[PDB]
Design a protein around this ligand. Structure first.
Ligand SMILES: [Cl-]
Ligand SMILES: [Cl-]
Ligand SMILES: [Cl-]
Ligand SMILES: [Cl-]
Ligand SMILES: [Cl-]
Ligand SMILES: [Cl-]
Ligand SMILES: [Cl-]
Ligand code: NA
Length: 129
């Protein structure tokens, strides 16, 4: 599913990502935009053979199992394809564990390079929330 901007914001808010670990909702929307373009079916292989899945491009090296990432972990105890559902519950819950790992949203390189230090609340502007 390709989410609408405010549609995704509302879904993330509902799931408690708004100000999770102090990251206002706009951070998560901004991140999702540059990770997946709001597409739950997004997948991208990394240089190391691991793959990123879903609206928040969660990595198979550490967080999910895709049957093909050698010497990887599965810290969110899920098959990676579960993250490609039109529903985002698995993504959001796994993201809560990631952003608590110590690095915050710097875990998402695209957030650090494209969202961090910007006016991220602009990503929820005009949204009814
Ligand atoms: Cl947009
Ligand atoms: Cl694997
Ligand atoms: Cl393969
Ligand atoms: Cl594991
Ligand atoms: Cl959802
Ligand atoms: Cl933090
Ligand atoms: Cl915000
Ligand atoms: Na894995």
């Amino acid at each position: 599913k390709v989410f609408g901007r405010c549609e995704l914001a509302a879904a993330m808010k509902r799931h408690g990502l708004d100000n999770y670990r102090g990251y206002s909702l706009g951070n998560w929307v901004c991140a999702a935009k540059f990770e997946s373009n709001f597409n739950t079916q997004a997948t991208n292989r990394n240089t190391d053979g691991s793959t990123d899945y879903g609206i928040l491009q969660i990595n198979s090296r550490w967080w999910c199992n895709d049957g093909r990432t050698p010497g990887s972990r599965n810290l969110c105890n899920i098959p990676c394809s579960a993250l490609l559902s039109s529903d985002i519950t698995a993504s959001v819950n796994c993201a809560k564990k990631i952003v608590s790992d110590g690095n915050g949203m710097n875990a998402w390189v695209a957030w650090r390079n494209r969202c961090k230090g910007t006016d991220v609340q602009a990503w929820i502007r005009g949204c009814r929330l």
